[PDB]
Amino acid sequence: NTPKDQEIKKLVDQNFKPLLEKYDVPGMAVGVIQNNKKYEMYYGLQSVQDKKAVNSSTIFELGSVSKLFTATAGGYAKNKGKISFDDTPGKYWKELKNTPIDQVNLLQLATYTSGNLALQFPDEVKTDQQVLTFFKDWKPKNSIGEYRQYSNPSIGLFGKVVALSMNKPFDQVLEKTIFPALGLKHSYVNVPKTQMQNYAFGYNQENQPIRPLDAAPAYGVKSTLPDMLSFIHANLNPQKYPADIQRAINETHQGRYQVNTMYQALGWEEFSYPATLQTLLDSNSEQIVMKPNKVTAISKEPSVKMYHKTGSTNGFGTYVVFIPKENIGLVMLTNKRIPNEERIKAAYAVLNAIK
């Protein structure tokens, strides 16, 4: 008939390639992993002016997909006994002791239920001093633990606490501990000089090339398609890893509460599988992403589940999704933002069509 690598290439061509013309995207990397086999598709240019093709070495910004690595770092520290998720941040950032934010526990920060943390840090919050002062000045609003409000500050504080508990700067926790444990050799918080030639330009909505530190746990990671597929492989096969990181990965798969059809895990969003397309689109709706929503306890603990996460920066888009019981996952990286719904729909059509 037709070899499987060609079949998957055709499906990615049918569902992802048209997005390049439709949204004027310079470069894209799409990868599928199925039964521990990797399929990689590279399109377009990492740098338009340099005529450098997207390839297996191309480095992209992950945006909020970076939180998946922060979540994994948190599970690692927890299962190593460096933190408990019932701890409060002042136990580790002592300057926050005796402040309102010291009533919020680590799980609540990691899953956005402090009750009064906005999507972004204020533009004027730049230094670690202004970050500290931002959190000491924080005051509650809604009951802590009651409302989900997607928040970069919230998981940014989580990651700072994780770094403090491991006695290392957060960038070192990832580059010296978590990335090596996961077998990722081309993933970075800070892209070294020797790799700038592989660092894609991001492109804004005029197709112009473009490119605080405590915000790095929320959106500071860069990576390649091979590394992101290895990361998806790790999430599909935690048992293939040492106990410390195996337990860390599993920690990130544990649903913590629900908002309608969405289960909030650590970093990952989780869904009963099979999931309808609308369930997946709802997780990225304005209601869920931009507004507070009352959370509810998990009632149906789904036996068969899937996970995904979108992420964006000014010049980059990312989508990652995996389905443990089908042993399948997909990564999309672009050096131009495209609508999140397009990423989800295209991935849903590929994954459902794959034999």
Given a contact cutoff of 8 angstroms between Cβ atoms, the answer to whether 165 and 76 are in contact is: no
Boundaries of domain holding 37: 1-355
Residue 200 is classified by DSSP as: P
Number of DSSP helices (H) and strands (E) in the chain, helices first: 14, 15
Query: Which residues make beta-bridge pairs with 210?
Result: 202
Query: Which is nearest to 147 in space by CA: 113, 116, 105?
Result: 113
**Beta-carbon count within 10 A of 105 CB:** 19
Contact predicate 293/287, CB 8 Å: yes
Phi, psi of 313 (to 5 degrees): -125, 180
Instruction: Work out how many domains the chain is built from and give that number.
Output: 1
CB burial readout 287-304, b (16+ within 10 A) else e: ebeeebbebeeeeeeeee
Give CA–CA dist 351/355, Å, rounded: 9
Q: Using N-to-C axis directions, what is the helix angle for 128-136 and 152-165, rounded to 10°?
A: 110
CA nearest neighbour of 73 among 301, 264, 251, 256: 251
Q: Can you say whether residue 60 is alpha, beta or left, with left for phi > 0 and alpha for psi between -120 and 50 degrees? A: beta
CB atoms within 10 A of CB 143: 10
**178: closest CA among 92, 252, 265?**
252
Q: In the chain, which ranges are continuous DSSP H helix?
A: 4-15, 17-22, 67-79, 106-110, 128-136, 152-165, 170-172, 179-181, 216-219, 225-236, 243-252, 277-282, 286-290, 340-353
Widest CA span of the chain, in angstroms? 68
Are 42 and 53 in contact, with CB atoms under 8 Å apart? yes
Torsion of the alpha carbons at 31, 34, 38 and 39, rounded to the nearest 10: -50
The DSSP H or E segment spanning 150 is none
Strand partners, 42: 29
Please identify which residue in the block is written with the tokens 């999140």.
340
Question: Six-digit token pair at 245?
Answer: 């990181």
Distance CA 300, CA 322 (A): 20
- DSSP conformation class of 201: P
User: Which residues participate in catalysis according to the annotation?
Assistant: 64
Q: In angstroms, rounded to a whole number, what is the distance separating the alpha carbons of residues 72 and 342?
A: 27
How large is the angle between the packed helices 152-165 and 67-79, nearest 10 degrees?
40
CB atoms within 10 A of CB 144: 18
Alpha-carbon span 99 to 40, nearest angstrom: 49
Count of CA atoms in the C-beta half-sphere (13 A) of 263: 22
Q: Which two tokens stand for residue 183?
A: 């077998």
Token pair belonging to 286: 């304005």
Residue 140 to residue 23: CA distance in whole angstroms: 41
Selection from 135, 69, 150 nearest residue 104 by Cα:
135
Q: Which residues lie closer than 8 Å to 28 by C-beta, 6 or more apart? A: 16, 19, 20, 42, 43, 44, 54, 332, 333, 334, 335
Token pair of 61 as six digits: 């910004």
- The Cα 255–Cα 264 span in angstroms is 5
